[PDB]
Amino acid sequence: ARSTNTFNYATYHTLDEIYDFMDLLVAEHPQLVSKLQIGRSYEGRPIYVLKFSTGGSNRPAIWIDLGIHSREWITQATGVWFAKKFTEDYGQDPSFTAILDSMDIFLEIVTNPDGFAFTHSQNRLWRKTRSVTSSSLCVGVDANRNWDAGFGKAGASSSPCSETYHGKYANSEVEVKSIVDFVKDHGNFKAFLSIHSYSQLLLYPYGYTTQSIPDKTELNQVAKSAVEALKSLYGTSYKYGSIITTIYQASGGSIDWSYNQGIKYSFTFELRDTGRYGFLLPASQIIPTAQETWLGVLTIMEHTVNN
Amino acid sequence: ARSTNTFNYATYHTLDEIYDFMDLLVAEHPQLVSKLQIGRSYEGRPIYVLKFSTGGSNRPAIWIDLGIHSREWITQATGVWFAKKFTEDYGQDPSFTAILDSMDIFLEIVTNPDGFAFTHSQNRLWRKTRSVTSSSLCVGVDANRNWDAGFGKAGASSSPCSETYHGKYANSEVEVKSIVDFVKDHGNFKAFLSIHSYSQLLLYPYGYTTQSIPDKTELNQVAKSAVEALKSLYGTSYKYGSIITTIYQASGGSIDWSYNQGIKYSFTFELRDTGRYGFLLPASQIIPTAQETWLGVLTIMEHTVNN
Amino acid sequence: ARSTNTFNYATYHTLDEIYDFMDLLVAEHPQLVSKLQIGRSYEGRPIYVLKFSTGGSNRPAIWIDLGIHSREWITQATGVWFAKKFTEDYGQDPSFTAILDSMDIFLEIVTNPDGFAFTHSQNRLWRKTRSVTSSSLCVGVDANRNWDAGFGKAGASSSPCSETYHGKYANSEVEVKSIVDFVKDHGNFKAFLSIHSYSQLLLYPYGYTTQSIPDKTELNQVAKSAVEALKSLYGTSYKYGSIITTIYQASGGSIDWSYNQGIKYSFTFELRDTGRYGFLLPASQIIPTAQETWLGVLTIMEHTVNN
Ligand SMILES: O=C(O)[C@H](Cc1ccccc1)CC(O)(O)C[N+](=O)[O-]
Ligand SMILES: O=C(O)[C@H](Cc1ccccc1)CC(O)(O)C[N+](=O)[O-]
Ligand SMILES: O=C(O)[C@H](Cc1ccccc1)CC(O)(O)C[N+](=O)[O-]
Ligand SMILES: [Zn+2]
Ligand SMILES: [Zn+2]
Ligand SMILES: [Zn+2]
Fold this sequence. Notes:
The structure is a homotrimer. Chain A is built from 9 helices and 8 strands. An 8-stranded mixed β-sheet of chain A has the order 1-2-4-3-5-8-6-7, sandwiched between helices. Bound molecules: (2R)-4,4-dihydroxy-5-nitro-2-(phenylmethyl)pentanoic acid (BPX) (3 copies) and zinc ion (ZN) (3 copies). Chains A, B, C: Monomer. May form a complex with proelastase 2.
């Protein structure tokens, strides 16, 4: 595709195609989008974040990371769609235009590029990073159990060979540390959304502890409204609540870390399909999934701009 | 450097320094080395191939190209080291001497001279050529996606601005066509090796198709022996296999083209570092990388001379 | 015959006559038909596929293979009639024209050329390939038990001398691997039809397992519609259903592999006669069989283009 207008949003793409997509979008919308490299993956691949801004100096921001678990293909596909949608709706949709006129959005489409490349090359269901560390045959860490929020506690595995291995220590994975450094340096993030796939859930803070967050009432209602908005499009039903009470105890998670940094609107989305196809969600559902999910994300952004 | 004996092999050099190196070597070893200009780059720079021969008439040959991707500096540096090594070992090492007594070696140290100059003056990470298309303000083509082997198929970009742009048509880039005309004219090449950088892999034919080559078993055995020889020096671990099964589908590749020309021993090396430094490999690793890679290349040459 | 217009479609032909037929058709309809060589048989004979296309780039396609079992002569004869039929009906029959204006059809008339030549020269009832086994005096493999779908499981024999020998490993037979690679590389096939002879059956996915396919309801109805269309011409009755529930458990089959690749409309046809003549079907039945079978095939293609 020589234009984001010829890019096939209804099909799954490779790392190269998505990175090329990034440059096309920036070339096509230079006053709105820019490409930032926040680090290099374990295998040296550049880690890219698309910044959507209409100006200002470090305006309140919204963080959105997708594909931290490589096999969750619907997320990277949705991230690409999100990127295009932002450029299409700014100056067209009153609400989204208002958000971007006062806030910046940072979108990381492929948070785990080495694993993504691997899902295309050797194993479609690979989910961890591709780091090799100590005296262990196995490879990779579950990057979403590597964050410094209840790191190493129940809800993660200490076995390097486990699919939910948390890594040697908090932030050991460069893919995670790169985000931590960017967000802490920025210092003005108001929302932090992590997109994952399948189970159709919208969860808020703490998977590592049963302690209720100080903002439970508000985040719970924001989640309720977001799920209803998402549902209004195709009838896709999502369940919502805190991570630990909704799915299970899970430690070292991204939104527990961001919420503890003071980023109030921290939520994690588990996208489409409740198991019919699971991680192998048909390409025919990419656009519909992205469209409905957008409604839920926009709902959250709206609460962030007015609060 | 006034002599190839004073040339600093442990540091990265410029195009001028490498070209001057070629003349020093030819002047020092007239009966063994000659400099051939197989064409001119897009920007008019001469394209040089060092020919190592001990006589004969169009003897079976071995082709070795390095630096087709300009930013992969470890390859041009290794290419220079190789040239020097050939002159030191011929007549001394039993095996290499036997190889050059029945075969010629054609070494192209800087296959993409325009890109190389660009990496020194404007962008250290530039990889494509410097050709200027017509309907785009972007520059260059991925020379290793421009060959007439599955040209234009999945595994390359049709967008001129892409880092993996395949170009207008097969062999559009003069840097590629120059090699194609040279090899076709010669008509007696038995080996074709393309040297690239980082990921530590030794790959054989077909990145453009899942079809296994008719000589898969043999090339796989050769690759296995070559990686073990390379590993024997410093313990550097290389993985091997076909391009598509090891990495991913990639079209317009050089060894896919050479193999389809009837050149059985077609391999591509992806040199040192698995991502720690990536393309910015420290100069302190030049000599060790060249040394170990040499063992692997020699292994391939040996299987070519006895078969 | 110097023209496909004088070609005798009511008689059985040799490999050479069919191959010459292909060239005549291509010469007469260059804008619609092209001949592709997708590989070489065990004994080195070219393996040809006729591509019918009105343009486009990698358009959704329909695959049709015939003669994988050499003695099933009615299939190759039907393949020849099919090829001619497509060139006569495009631009004449609204439905077929619509199919070709949006889709490509790939037709392999003689999937097992070595065996075909053998049925003409040595054994009219030979059905396997002609590959030579290392430690065995027996020759050939049952190409339709060599596919990577339940390969080696119940429903095939591991004995080289058996008429249903599955071979050393999945895809061991180049006649099978050639199709696999082509279809995999293409990546946009929507239907995969394999044509065999006698029993008068139309079967859908899974002969190796009793597991019901996710698309059983749709394929079953499509099958019902296809058999009704086929019967409507001469009253030929066909039975339909899954391979395992209709005939018997059979592993390594073509449509089990194609369906598992994501090609929804995968069906296998067992043509005319329920046993009176068996494999030795009279030439006088070639055209009537081809005509009625076409209606069934067209029916499937129609469902493929609208879904
Ligand atoms: O617990 C996990 O690792 C996630 C679910 C999740 C998501 C966010 C916070 C805590 C848990 C599962 C998944 O989304 O990665 C899907 N999966 O690859 O099993
Ligand atoms: O796919 C590529 O373009 C190469 C790897 C490669 C090398 C040979 C044949 C097929 C692929 C990557 C590289 O060696 O050029 C390093 N890079 O990404 O600049
Ligand atoms: O099992 C076979 O070999 C086929 C029947 C068949 C056909 C398709 C998928 C599974 C089985 C019988 C035949 O069509 O090959 C006729 N024959 O016995 O040569
Ligand atoms: Zn996940
Ligand atoms: Zn390279
Ligand atoms: Zn059959």
